[PDB]
Amino acid sequence: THWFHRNPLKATAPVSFNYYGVVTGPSASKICNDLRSSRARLLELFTDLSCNPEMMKNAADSYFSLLQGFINSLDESTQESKLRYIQNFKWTDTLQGQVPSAQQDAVFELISMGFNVALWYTKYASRLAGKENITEDEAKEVHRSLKIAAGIFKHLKESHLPKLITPAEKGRDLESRLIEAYVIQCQAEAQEVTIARAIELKHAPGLIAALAYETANFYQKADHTLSSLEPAYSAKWRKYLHLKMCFYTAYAYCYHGETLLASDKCGEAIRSLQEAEKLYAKAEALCKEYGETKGPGPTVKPSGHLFFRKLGNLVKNTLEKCQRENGFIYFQKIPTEAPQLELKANYGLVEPIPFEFPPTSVQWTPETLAAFDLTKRPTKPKPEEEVKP
Amino acid sequence: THWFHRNPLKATAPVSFNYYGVVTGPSASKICNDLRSSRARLLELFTDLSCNPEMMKNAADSYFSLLQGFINSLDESTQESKLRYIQNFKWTDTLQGQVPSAQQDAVFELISMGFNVALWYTKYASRLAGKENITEDEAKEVHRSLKIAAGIFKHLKESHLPKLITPAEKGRDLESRLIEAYVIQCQAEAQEVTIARAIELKHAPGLIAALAYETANFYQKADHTLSSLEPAYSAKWRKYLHLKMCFYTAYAYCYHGETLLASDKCGEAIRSLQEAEKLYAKAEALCKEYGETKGPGPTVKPSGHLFFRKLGNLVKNTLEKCQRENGFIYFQKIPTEAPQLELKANYGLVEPIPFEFPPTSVQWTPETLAAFDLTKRPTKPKPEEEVKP
Amino acid sequence: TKNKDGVLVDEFGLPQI
Amino acid sequence: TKNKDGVLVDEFGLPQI
């Protein structure tokens, strides 16, 4: 089964959307109720394990299309809503623990709620993927859910983060590097699911080696993207990314050795299988060095036993072939260095499923908007705590 | 099949035993003819490939019992024959090529002819052992012939060499070290024959390891015994002894690994099998480094392919057992050093078959002896060349 | 369905076999 | 025949099996 590290959900303070004298009419009054109720419905779903992607999408759709009114102009989008700065929103971050952050900007709310929705997908994905009984359709759903999340993250970063007036801090969820790492991670993870399948269905070793390799690179990339953060909060996560890089590079060498073998090349085949097992042991090292490190999110232990059942066969096949040359044991002449993997995976690479927010609600009409009279203006709650497992 | 290095036979000048006026009677005259003819019959046999040990023993018996008269007193042995210094004998040596050596002493003749007889046995043994078709009885005959030769050599050294008036040179056949090395070599060789059999009949690995080990030691010992000589003539021979030490130490490690394996000890088993294959390759090295070196005797190439057919099985059995511990490949934790072999072989060690020369001939009687009148006294031939293969 | 090179591919992007 | 320890042994000195 699959093991994916998860940082905690973002938490927020409840918003009543109650503007009092400012709201002069029934239509404007109704929207505030819709916002209040749809935001709350969405927030409670994050902690509902019985919730599925159809339900999550419908709630997000509701809230976001309403929320859009505080941001976009009615049909004139490319023109900005007068309501944007009306409300202060308060959100915590995945790596900052219970320390909240506030902006009176509807865009800050949109992006932060978006993030959580994307987070929810990767978490729906990881729970479903932790199943030992996992079926093919569940794996598609895992694979697909991770692609949704990737696309959302990407959309937030590309089309949204630039709109914020005040820049977010290093180590905060809405910052290019941090979002970029979430995007990359999601793709890596989807590919993990593809690899386990390519392995089940007995696809060509060269296919599986390239895919494993590229996946190791994604993890490297993500790790590098995060290297810019402060070790305190990024440590455990990075340890886990480094772990995953090794785990999958081993796979690359193992399956790439089978390539080299079928190529009548022995010494490098053996040197490749050796690199694999060495790497795989190095991954066991980093694995509980990761179990030590204190950081955001519960620590995760890999169930998968496969690597050795594969390597044993390869090792046994290689020795049969490469004895009377290099083997039987005490090998020569084996190349001092591991053969450098340069591999492109033509199959199994994952693209983010392109995301866009729903259009501004039909409920937002000029009259309804006019019924918010900002000339009628003259304490704070705290984030309700996410409270997961 | 077995491969044993052989230095060349010793060559001698023909002796007529013709003393003229000194021989005053028919009995004394007859003995001189008997000596002349029996010495020649014996000399020609050395080059007769159709000659067997029964024939060789009968001729040696003849010549030696007659010759004994020039040495021992008739019934008074412990008293010395007046004839000892009557005749000059000329012999070449195994390591000195065509450069002869002479003594007018019957003991020099006895010991030198003895040496050749012993040499003949080891050569009869090596020819018979070079057969690819070799049967069990032939191998007994090989094994037995080597034990005869060992016993002769030992007898010459122990009970005879001390009697010579003038000491032989370093690098000459009649010298303690050189004879000692021939004794040791013969035992080593007999054991080789025992090892090949212990292997055929599938004797316990611990038996075969100890025997192989001890044999490697004999070769070491012989090599050390010869180290005192001058590299020129001793080089090739020593190269071959060093070769044999390695070849059989490998066997020791290979079969000792099987011991360690059945003992549920993996790392050393693997380290032991590794030492074996490393050593066995080192033996291939020394083997044609021996083919290069110029020295006495034709150079010999091992036919035996066995080591690997054994090691493969062991290696395959060890990995099955010792994977999930040390293997599958890229092993740890394997001990830096080869496990030190200290092994006594309770079975298969070879003792020289005790030798003695035949008693002085019944033909030697006081009257016959008196018929040699030494008061009746007042150019040289050259050694006839041995000319083998 | 198919990928850009015209080869049949499953939902995971793997060739069909 | 037998060796010094009383165990049956062949002409080569190996135990009989």
Short mmCIF file of N, CA, C and O in Angstrom, two decimals, chain B residues 7-119:
data_model
loop_
_atom_site.label_atom_id
_atom_site.label_comp_id
_atom_site.label_asym_id
_atom_site.label_seq_id
_atom_site.Cartn_x
_atom_site.Cartn_y
_atom_site.Cartn_z
N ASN B 7 61.23 -32.42 -12.38
CA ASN B 7 62.59 -32.08 -12.77
C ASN B 7 63.21 -33.28 -13.49
O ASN B 7 62.73 -34.41 -13.33
N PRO B 8 64.25 -33.05 -14.30
CA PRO B 8 64.82 -34.12 -15.13
C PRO B 8 65.53 -35.24 -14.34
O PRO B 8 65.97 -35.02 -13.21
N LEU B 9 65.62 -36.43 -14.94
CA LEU B 9 66.36 -37.53 -14.33
C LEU B 9 67.84 -37.19 -14.24
O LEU B 9 68.37 -36.40 -15.03
N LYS B 10 68.51 -37.80 -13.27
CA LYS B 10 69.95 -37.70 -13.13
C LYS B 10 70.61 -38.60 -14.17
O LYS B 10 70.12 -39.69 -14.46
N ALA B 11 71.72 -38.13 -14.73
CA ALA B 11 72.47 -38.90 -15.72
C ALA B 11 73.85 -39.26 -15.16
O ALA B 11 74.38 -38.57 -14.29
N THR B 12 74.43 -40.33 -15.68
CA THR B 12 75.70 -40.83 -15.15
C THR B 12 76.59 -41.36 -16.27
O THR B 12 76.12 -41.67 -17.37
N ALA B 13 77.89 -41.44 -16.01
CA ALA B 13 78.81 -42.11 -16.93
C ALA B 13 78.75 -43.61 -16.70
O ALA B 13 78.55 -44.06 -15.56
N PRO B 14 78.91 -44.39 -17.77
CA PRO B 14 78.87 -45.85 -17.67
C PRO B 14 80.07 -46.36 -16.88
O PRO B 14 81.18 -45.85 -17.04
N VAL B 15 79.85 -47.35 -16.02
CA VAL B 15 80.93 -47.94 -15.25
C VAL B 15 81.16 -49.39 -15.69
O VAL B 15 80.24 -50.20 -15.68
N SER B 16 82.39 -49.72 -16.09
CA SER B 16 82.71 -51.07 -16.54
C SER B 16 83.06 -52.02 -15.39
O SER B 16 83.01 -53.24 -15.56
N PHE B 17 83.40 -51.47 -14.24
CA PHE B 17 83.87 -52.26 -13.10
C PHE B 17 85.03 -53.17 -13.50
O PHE B 17 85.13 -54.29 -13.00
N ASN B 18 85.89 -52.69 -14.40
CA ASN B 18 86.99 -53.51 -14.88
C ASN B 18 88.29 -53.11 -14.19
O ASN B 18 88.89 -52.09 -14.53
N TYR B 19 88.72 -53.93 -13.24
CA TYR B 19 89.91 -53.63 -12.43
C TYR B 19 91.19 -54.39 -12.82
O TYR B 19 92.24 -54.20 -12.21
N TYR B 20 91.09 -55.25 -13.83
CA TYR B 20 92.26 -55.93 -14.40
C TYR B 20 92.99 -56.82 -13.41
O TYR B 20 92.39 -57.69 -12.78
N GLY B 21 94.31 -56.61 -13.28
CA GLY B 21 95.15 -57.48 -12.47
C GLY B 21 94.68 -57.60 -11.04
O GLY B 21 94.97 -58.59 -10.35
N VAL B 22 93.96 -56.59 -10.59
CA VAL B 22 93.38 -56.56 -9.25
C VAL B 22 92.44 -57.74 -9.02
O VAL B 22 92.38 -58.28 -7.92
N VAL B 23 91.72 -58.15 -10.06
CA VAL B 23 90.78 -59.26 -9.93
C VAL B 23 91.47 -60.55 -10.29
O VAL B 23 91.78 -60.80 -11.46
N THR B 24 91.72 -61.36 -9.27
CA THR B 24 92.55 -62.54 -9.40
C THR B 24 91.79 -63.87 -9.54
O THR B 24 92.41 -64.93 -9.62
N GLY B 25 90.46 -63.82 -9.54
CA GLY B 25 89.70 -65.05 -9.52
C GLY B 25 88.35 -65.00 -10.21
O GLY B 25 87.77 -63.93 -10.38
N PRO B 26 87.82 -66.18 -10.58
CA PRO B 26 86.53 -66.32 -11.27
C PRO B 26 85.34 -65.72 -10.51
O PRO B 26 84.51 -65.06 -11.13
N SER B 27 85.25 -65.95 -9.21
CA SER B 27 84.14 -65.38 -8.44
C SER B 27 84.17 -63.85 -8.47
O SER B 27 83.15 -63.22 -8.74
N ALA B 28 85.33 -63.25 -8.20
CA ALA B 28 85.46 -61.80 -8.24
C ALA B 28 85.21 -61.27 -9.65
O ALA B 28 84.65 -60.18 -9.84
N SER B 29 85.62 -62.05 -10.63
CA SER B 29 85.44 -61.68 -12.02
C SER B 29 83.95 -61.65 -12.37
O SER B 29 83.46 -60.71 -13.00
N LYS B 30 83.23 -62.68 -11.94
CA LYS B 30 81.80 -62.77 -12.17
C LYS B 30 81.02 -61.59 -11.56
O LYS B 30 80.14 -61.03 -12.20
N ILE B 31 81.36 -61.21 -10.33
CA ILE B 31 80.70 -60.08 -9.68
C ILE B 31 80.87 -58.78 -10.47
O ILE B 31 79.92 -57.99 -10.60
N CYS B 32 82.07 -58.53 -10.98
CA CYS B 32 82.31 -57.32 -11.78
C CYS B 32 81.42 -57.30 -13.02
O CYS B 32 80.95 -56.24 -13.43
N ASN B 33 81.20 -58.47 -13.61
CA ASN B 33 80.30 -58.59 -14.75
C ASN B 33 78.87 -58.34 -14.33
O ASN B 33 78.10 -57.67 -15.03
N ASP B 34 78.50 -58.89 -13.17
CA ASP B 34 77.16 -58.71 -12.64
C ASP B 34 76.87 -57.24 -12.35
O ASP B 34 75.80 -56.74 -12.69
N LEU B 35 77.84 -56.55 -11.73
CA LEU B 35 77.73 -55.13 -11.44
C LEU B 35 77.62 -54.34 -12.74
O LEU B 35 76.74 -53.48 -12.88
N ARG B 36 78.51 -54.63 -13.68
CA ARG B 36 78.50 -53.93 -14.95
C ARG B 36 77.16 -54.08 -15.66
O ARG B 36 76.59 -53.10 -16.15
N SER B 37 76.65 -55.30 -15.70
CA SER B 37 75.43 -55.57 -16.45
C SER B 37 74.18 -55.12 -15.71
O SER B 37 73.24 -54.61 -16.32
N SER B 38 74.16 -55.29 -14.39
CA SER B 38 72.98 -54.92 -13.62
C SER B 38 72.86 -53.40 -13.49
O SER B 38 71.75 -52.87 -13.44
N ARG B 39 73.99 -52.70 -13.44
CA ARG B 39 73.96 -51.24 -13.41
C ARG B 39 73.41 -50.70 -14.72
O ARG B 39 72.64 -49.74 -14.72
N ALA B 40 73.80 -51.32 -15.83
CA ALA B 40 73.38 -50.86 -17.15
C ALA B 40 71.92 -51.17 -17.41
O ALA B 40 71.19 -50.35 -17.98
N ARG B 41 71.49 -52.36 -17.00
CA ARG B 41 70.10 -52.76 -17.11
C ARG B 41 69.22 -51.76 -16.35
O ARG B 41 68.19 -51.31 -16.85
N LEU B 42 69.67 -51.38 -15.16
CA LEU B 42 68.93 -50.43 -14.33
C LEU B 42 68.88 -49.05 -14.99
O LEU B 42 67.83 -48.41 -15.03
N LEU B 43 70.01 -48.60 -15.51
CA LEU B 43 70.07 -47.29 -16.14
C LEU B 43 69.15 -47.18 -17.37
O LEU B 43 68.51 -46.15 -17.57
N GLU B 44 69.08 -48.22 -18.18
CA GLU B 44 68.25 -48.16 -19.37
C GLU B 44 66.76 -48.16 -19.04
O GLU B 44 65.95 -47.64 -19.81
N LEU B 45 66.40 -48.74 -17.90
CA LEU B 45 65.00 -48.84 -17.49
C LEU B 45 64.38 -47.47 -17.21
O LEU B 45 63.20 -47.25 -17.46
N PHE B 46 65.19 -46.56 -16.66
CA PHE B 46 64.73 -45.21 -16.35
C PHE B 46 64.06 -44.54 -17.55
O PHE B 46 63.13 -43.75 -17.39
N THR B 47 64.55 -44.85 -18.74
CA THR B 47 64.00 -44.28 -19.97
C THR B 47 63.01 -45.19 -20.70
O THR B 47 62.53 -44.86 -21.78
N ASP B 48 62.72 -46.35 -20.12
CA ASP B 48 61.77 -47.28 -20.73
C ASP B 48 60.38 -47.04 -20.17
O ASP B 48 60.10 -47.33 -19.00
N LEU B 49 59.48 -46.53 -21.01
CA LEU B 49 58.15 -46.17 -20.55
C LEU B 49 57.30 -47.41 -20.28
O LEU B 49 56.30 -47.35 -19.56
N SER B 50 57.71 -48.53 -20.86
CA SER B 50 56.97 -49.77 -20.67
C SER B 50 57.35 -50.41 -19.34
O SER B 50 56.80 -51.44 -18.95
N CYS B 51 58.29 -49.79 -18.64
CA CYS B 51 58.75 -50.32 -17.36
C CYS B 51 57.76 -50.04 -16.23
O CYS B 51 57.26 -48.93 -16.09
N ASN B 52 57.52 -51.05 -15.39
CA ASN B 52 56.62 -50.88 -14.26
C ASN B 52 57.38 -51.08 -12.93
O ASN B 52 58.55 -51.42 -12.94
N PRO B 53 56.70 -50.85 -11.79
CA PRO B 53 57.38 -50.85 -10.48
C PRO B 53 57.93 -52.21 -10.06
O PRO B 53 58.91 -52.28 -9.32
N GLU B 54 57.29 -53.29 -10.51
CA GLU B 54 57.78 -54.63 -10.22
C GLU B 54 59.14 -54.84 -10.89
O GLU B 54 60.07 -55.38 -10.27
N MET B 55 59.25 -54.41 -12.14
CA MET B 55 60.50 -54.53 -12.87
C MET B 55 61.57 -53.63 -12.27
O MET B 55 62.71 -54.06 -12.10
N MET B 56 61.20 -52.39 -11.96
CA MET B 56 62.14 -51.42 -11.39
C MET B 56 62.69 -51.89 -10.06
O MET B 56 63.87 -51.73 -9.77
N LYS B 57 61.82 -52.48 -9.24
CA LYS B 57 62.25 -52.94 -7.94
C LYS B 57 63.23 -54.11 -8.07
O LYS B 57 64.24 -54.17 -7.35
N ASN B 58 62.94 -55.02 -8.99
CA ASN B 58 63.81 -56.16 -9.21
C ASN B 58 65.22 -55.75 -9.69
O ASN B 58 66.23 -56.26 -9.19
N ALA B 59 65.29 -54.81 -10.63
CA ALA B 59 66.58 -54.30 -11.09
C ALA B 59 67.34 -53.55 -9.98
O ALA B 59 68.51 -53.83 -9.73
N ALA B 60 66.68 -52.60 -9.32
CA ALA B 60 67.29 -51.90 -8.20
C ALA B 60 67.81 -52.90 -7.16
O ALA B 60 68.95 -52.81 -6.71
N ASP B 61 66.96 -53.87 -6.80
CA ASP B 61 67.34 -54.92 -5.87
C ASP B 61 68.64 -55.60 -6.30
O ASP B 61 69.55 -55.79 -5.50
N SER B 62 68.71 -55.97 -7.58
CA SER B 62 69.91 -56.58 -8.12
C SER B 62 71.10 -55.68 -7.91
O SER B 62 72.03 -56.00 -7.18
N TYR B 63 71.06 -54.53 -8.57
CA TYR B 63 72.20 -53.64 -8.56
C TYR B 63 72.64 -53.31 -7.14
O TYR B 63 73.81 -53.43 -6.79
N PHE B 64 71.68 -52.89 -6.32
CA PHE B 64 71.99 -52.41 -4.98
C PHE B 64 72.58 -53.47 -4.06
O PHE B 64 73.47 -53.17 -3.26
N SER B 65 72.10 -54.70 -4.16
CA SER B 65 72.62 -55.76 -3.31
C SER B 65 74.06 -56.10 -3.69
O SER B 65 74.88 -56.43 -2.83
N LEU B 66 74.37 -56.02 -4.98
CA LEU B 66 75.73 -56.18 -5.46
C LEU B 66 76.59 -55.00 -5.02
O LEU B 66 77.65 -55.17 -4.42
N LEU B 67 76.11 -53.81 -5.33
CA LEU B 67 76.82 -52.59 -4.96
C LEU B 67 77.14 -52.56 -3.48
O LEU B 67 78.22 -52.11 -3.09
N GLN B 68 76.22 -53.05 -2.65
CA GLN B 68 76.38 -53.05 -1.20
C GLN B 68 77.73 -53.63 -0.79
O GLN B 68 78.31 -53.23 0.22
N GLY B 69 78.23 -54.58 -1.57
CA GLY B 69 79.53 -55.17 -1.30
C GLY B 69 80.69 -54.20 -1.26
O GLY B 69 81.66 -54.42 -0.54
N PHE B 70 80.62 -53.13 -2.05
CA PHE B 70 81.68 -52.11 -2.05
C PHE B 70 81.61 -51.24 -0.80
O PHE B 70 82.46 -50.38 -0.58
N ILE B 71 80.57 -51.45 0.00
CA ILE B 71 80.27 -50.56 1.11
C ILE B 71 80.29 -51.30 2.45
O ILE B 71 81.12 -51.01 3.31
N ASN B 72 79.36 -52.24 2.61
CA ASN B 72 79.23 -52.98 3.86
C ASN B 72 80.24 -54.10 3.98
O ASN B 72 80.70 -54.64 2.98
N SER B 73 80.58 -54.45 5.22
CA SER B 73 81.38 -55.65 5.49
C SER B 73 80.47 -56.87 5.38
O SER B 73 79.25 -56.76 5.51
N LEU B 74 81.06 -58.03 5.13
CA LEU B 74 80.26 -59.18 4.70
C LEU B 74 79.13 -59.60 5.66
O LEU B 74 77.95 -59.33 5.38
N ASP B 75 79.46 -60.25 6.78
CA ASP B 75 78.50 -60.42 7.88
C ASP B 75 78.71 -59.40 8.99
O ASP B 75 77.89 -59.27 9.90
N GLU B 76 79.82 -58.69 8.89
CA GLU B 76 80.31 -57.80 9.95
C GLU B 76 79.80 -56.39 9.80
O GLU B 76 80.33 -55.48 10.44
N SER B 77 78.81 -56.20 8.94
CA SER B 77 78.31 -54.86 8.63
C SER B 77 78.20 -54.15 9.95
O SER B 77 77.80 -54.74 10.95
N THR B 78 78.53 -52.86 9.94
CA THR B 78 79.16 -52.15 11.06
C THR B 78 80.68 -52.19 10.89
O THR B 78 81.42 -51.55 11.64
N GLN B 79 81.14 -52.94 9.89
CA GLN B 79 82.52 -52.85 9.43
C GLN B 79 82.50 -52.48 7.94
O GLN B 79 81.58 -52.86 7.22
N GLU B 80 83.50 -51.73 7.48
CA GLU B 80 83.45 -51.13 6.15
C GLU B 80 84.23 -51.88 5.06
O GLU B 80 85.36 -52.29 5.28
N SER B 81 83.62 -52.00 3.89
CA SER B 81 84.22 -52.70 2.76
C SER B 81 85.49 -52.01 2.27
O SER B 81 85.51 -50.80 2.10
N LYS B 82 86.54 -52.79 2.03
CA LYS B 82 87.80 -52.25 1.53
C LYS B 82 87.69 -51.64 0.13
O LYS B 82 88.61 -50.97 -0.34
N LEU B 83 86.56 -51.89 -0.54
CA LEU B 83 86.37 -51.50 -1.94
C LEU B 83 85.71 -50.13 -2.11
O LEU B 83 85.55 -49.64 -3.22
N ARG B 84 85.34 -49.52 -0.99
CA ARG B 84 84.51 -48.33 -1.05
C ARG B 84 85.05 -47.25 -1.99
O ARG B 84 84.30 -46.66 -2.77
N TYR B 85 86.35 -47.00 -1.90
CA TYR B 85 86.98 -45.91 -2.65
C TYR B 85 87.62 -46.31 -3.97
O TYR B 85 88.37 -45.53 -4.55
N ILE B 86 87.39 -47.55 -4.39
CA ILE B 86 88.03 -48.11 -5.58
C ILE B 86 87.61 -47.43 -6.89
O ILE B 86 88.39 -47.34 -7.84
N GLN B 87 86.38 -46.94 -6.94
CA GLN B 87 85.77 -46.55 -8.20
C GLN B 87 85.26 -45.13 -8.14
O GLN B 87 84.69 -44.72 -7.13
N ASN B 88 85.45 -44.38 -9.22
CA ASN B 88 84.93 -43.02 -9.29
C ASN B 88 83.58 -42.98 -10.01
O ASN B 88 83.44 -43.51 -11.11
N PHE B 89 82.57 -42.38 -9.38
CA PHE B 89 81.26 -42.28 -10.02
C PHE B 89 80.91 -40.83 -10.37
O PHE B 89 81.27 -39.90 -9.64
N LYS B 90 80.20 -40.66 -11.48
CA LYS B 90 79.91 -39.34 -12.02
C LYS B 90 78.42 -39.19 -12.28
O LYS B 90 77.84 -39.97 -13.04
N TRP B 91 77.80 -38.19 -11.66
CA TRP B 91 76.36 -38.00 -11.77
C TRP B 91 76.01 -36.54 -11.99
O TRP B 91 76.64 -35.65 -11.42
N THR B 92 74.98 -36.30 -12.80
CA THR B 92 74.44 -34.95 -12.88
C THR B 92 73.31 -34.80 -11.87
O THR B 92 72.90 -35.77 -11.23
N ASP B 93 72.79 -33.59 -11.76
CA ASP B 93 71.78 -33.27 -10.77
C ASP B 93 70.53 -32.73 -11.45
O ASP B 93 70.58 -32.30 -12.60
N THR B 94 69.41 -32.76 -10.75
CA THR B 94 68.13 -32.38 -11.34
C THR B 94 68.10 -30.90 -11.69
O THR B 94 67.56 -30.50 -12.73
N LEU B 95 68.67 -30.08 -10.81
CA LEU B 95 68.66 -28.63 -10.99
C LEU B 95 69.90 -28.02 -11.67
O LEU B 95 69.88 -26.85 -12.03
N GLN B 96 70.96 -28.80 -11.83
CA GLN B 96 72.21 -28.28 -12.38
C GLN B 96 72.42 -28.52 -13.87
O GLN B 96 73.51 -28.28 -14.40
N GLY B 97 71.41 -29.04 -14.55
CA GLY B 97 71.53 -29.29 -15.98
C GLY B 97 72.54 -30.38 -16.30
O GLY B 97 72.49 -31.47 -15.74
N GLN B 98 73.47 -30.06 -17.20
CA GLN B 98 74.43 -31.04 -17.71
C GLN B 98 75.76 -31.03 -16.96
O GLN B 98 76.68 -31.77 -17.31
N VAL B 99 75.85 -30.21 -15.92
CA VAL B 99 77.08 -30.10 -15.15
C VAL B 99 77.19 -31.27 -14.17
O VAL B 99 76.43 -31.36 -13.20
N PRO B 100 78.17 -32.17 -14.39
CA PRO B 100 78.23 -33.39 -13.59
C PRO B 100 78.98 -33.17 -12.29
O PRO B 100 79.55 -32.10 -12.05
N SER B 101 79.00 -34.20 -11.46
CA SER B 101 79.68 -34.14 -10.18
C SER B 101 80.22 -35.54 -9.90
O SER B 101 79.56 -36.54 -10.19
N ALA B 102 81.42 -35.61 -9.34
CA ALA B 102 82.08 -36.90 -9.17
C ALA B 102 82.56 -37.14 -7.75
O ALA B 102 82.95 -36.21 -7.04
N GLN B 103 82.52 -38.40 -7.34
CA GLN B 103 83.16 -38.83 -6.10
C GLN B 103 83.68 -40.25 -6.26
O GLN B 103 83.02 -41.11 -6.87
N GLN B 104 84.85 -40.53 -5.70
CA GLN B 104 85.27 -41.91 -5.70
C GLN B 104 84.87 -42.37 -4.32
O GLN B 104 85.65 -42.36 -3.37
N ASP B 105 83.63 -42.82 -4.25
CA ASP B 105 83.04 -43.33 -3.03
C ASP B 105 81.84 -44.13 -3.50
O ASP B 105 81.03 -43.62 -4.28
N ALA B 106 81.66 -45.34 -2.97
CA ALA B 106 80.56 -46.16 -3.45
C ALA B 106 79.26 -45.57 -2.91
O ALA B 106 78.20 -45.71 -3.53
N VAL B 107 79.34 -44.91 -1.76
CA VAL B 107 78.17 -44.32 -1.12
C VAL B 107 77.57 -43.21 -1.99
O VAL B 107 76.35 -43.10 -2.11
N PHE B 108 78.42 -42.41 -2.61
CA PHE B 108 77.96 -41.40 -3.56
C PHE B 108 77.14 -42.06 -4.67
O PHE B 108 76.13 -41.53 -5.11
N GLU B 109 77.58 -43.24 -5.12
CA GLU B 109 76.89 -43.96 -6.19
C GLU B 109 75.55 -44.51 -5.73
O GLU B 109 74.52 -44.35 -6.41
N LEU B 110 75.57 -45.17 -4.58
CA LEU B 110 74.36 -45.68 -3.94
C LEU B 110 73.28 -44.59 -3.81
O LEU B 110 72.16 -44.75 -4.29
N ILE B 111 73.63 -43.48 -3.17
CA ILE B 111 72.68 -42.42 -2.91
C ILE B 111 72.16 -41.81 -4.20
O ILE B 111 70.96 -41.55 -4.32
N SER B 112 73.05 -41.58 -5.15
CA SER B 112 72.64 -40.98 -6.42
C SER B 112 71.74 -41.92 -7.22
O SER B 112 70.75 -41.48 -7.80
N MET B 113 72.08 -43.20 -7.26
CA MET B 113 71.23 -44.17 -7.94
C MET B 113 69.90 -44.34 -7.18
O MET B 113 68.84 -44.51 -7.79
N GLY B 114 69.97 -44.31 -5.85
CA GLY B 114 68.76 -44.35 -5.05
C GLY B 114 67.82 -43.22 -5.44
O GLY B 114 66.64 -43.45 -5.73
N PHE B 115 68.36 -42.01 -5.46
CA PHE B 115 67.63 -40.79 -5.82
C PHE B 115 66.88 -40.97 -7.14
O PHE B 115 65.68 -40.69 -7.24
N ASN B 116 67.60 -41.45 -8.15
CA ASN B 116 66.99 -41.69 -9.46
C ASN B 116 65.83 -42.68 -9.38
O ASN B 116 64.82 -42.52 -10.06
N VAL B 117 65.99 -43.71 -8.57
CA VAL B 117 64.96 -44.72 -8.42
C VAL B 117 63.72 -44.10 -7.81
O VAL B 117 62.60 -44.40 -8.21
N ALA B 118 63.93 -43.23 -6.83
CA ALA B 118 62.85 -42.51 -6.17
C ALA B 118 62.23 -41.56 -7.18
O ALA B 118 61.01 -41.44 -7.27
N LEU B 119 63.10 -40.88 -7.93
CA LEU B 119 62.65 -39.98 -8.99
C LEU B 119 61.80 -40.74 -9.97
O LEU B 119 60.76 -40.26 -10.42
#
